[PDB]
Amino acid sequence: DGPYLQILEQPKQRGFRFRYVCEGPSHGGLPGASSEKNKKSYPQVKICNYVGPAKVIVQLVTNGKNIHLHAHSLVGKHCEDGICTVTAGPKDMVVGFANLGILHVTKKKVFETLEARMTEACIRGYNPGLLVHPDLAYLQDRQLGDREKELIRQAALQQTKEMDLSVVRLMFTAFLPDSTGSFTRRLEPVVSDAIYDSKA
Ligand SMILES: *C(=N)N1CC[C@H](NS(=O)(=O)Cc2ccc(Cl)cc2Br)C1
């Protein structure tokens, strides 16, 4: 059986509030579903049917029937431009995320963000067929043609109206190395349970 990503512990659905810019940095983390005062635990995945070096990304996605990129940003260690990028392996294939925050996007900046996020996803091959638009399906970086840009602007416009800023999901995607060592072999992604803003 082929290599696949496994969720071992989900994020907890309720009880963690989305943070604002003004709270600054944080050493704390979105809790795992099984977390307790006395034994804190965190979202945790495992790469399976493969041992060796790997890349794991976390993206923030929506809780709609057609799952898309969310406008909020993952922040914390190993977070850039709303994506958390870590390594796995070469022996231990289990990866945890103990420093995840979900940063409120500026409403008014939802569109600009999405467009900003959709582009990067398409450039990097981070699930654009699935998460941006069906016809952007040519995943895998990438120099953007004019027709790609227009689907993106159109998608972003459309999906900005749809955006629910009170709920997100994590999407985990693992990458294995090609012959050159570049992490190119993308395994099918896995979506987490919904996370709802506490607002407290
Ligand atoms: C940033 N300057 N903020 C001011 C209000 C928020 N503060 S907080 O630390 O995020 C928690 C808080 C505190 C008081 C009130 Cl009334 C609401 C909230 Br969410 C962000």
Curated annotation (Swiss-Prot):
The modification S-nitrosocysteine is found at residue 22. It is found in: Nucleus; Cytoplasm. Residues 3-200 form the RHD domain. This is Nuclear factor NF-kappa-B p50 subunit. It comes from Homo sapiens. Changing residue 22 to S: Suppresses S-nitrosylation-induced inhibition of DNA-binding activity. Loss of S-(15-deoxy-Delta12,14-prostaglandin J2-9-yl)cysteine-induced inhibition of DNA-binding activity. A lipid is attached at residue 22 (S-(15-deoxy-Delta12,14-prostaglandin J2-9-yl)cysteine). Constitutes the active form, which associates with RELA/p65 to form the NF-kappa-B p65-p50 complex to form a transcription factor. Together with RELA/p65, binds to the kappa-B consensus sequence 5'-GGRNNYYCC-3', located in the enhancer region of genes involved in immune response and acute phase reactions.
